[PDB]
Amino acid sequence: VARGWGRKCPLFGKNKSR
C-alpha cells in the first residue's frame, strides 16, 4: 500500500509532504 501511508504518514511522504 502507498496512499494509506502517504496520507498522514511520512513513511511514504517525505519530500512529498515536506
Cell of 4: 494509506
**Alpha-carbon distances of 12 from 1, 7, rounded to whole Å:** 10, 8
The owner of cell 517525505 is 14
DSSP run (H or E) holding 8:
none
How many angstroms separate the CA atoms of 18 and 7, rounded?
Answer: 13
Mapped onto helix, strand or coil, the DSSP state of residue 17 is coil
User: What is the rounded CA–CA span in Å between residue 9 and residue 3?
Assistant: 9
Contact 2, 12 (CB under 8 A): yes
Look up residue 1 and give its three cell numbers: 500500500
Phi-psi domain of 4 (left: phi exceeds 0; alpha: psi -120 through 50; beta: other): alpha
Q: According to the entry, how was the structure determined?
A: NMR
| Number of alpha helices (DSSP H) and beta strands (DSSP E) in the chain | 1, 0
Q: Which three cell numbers stand for residue 18?
A: 515536506
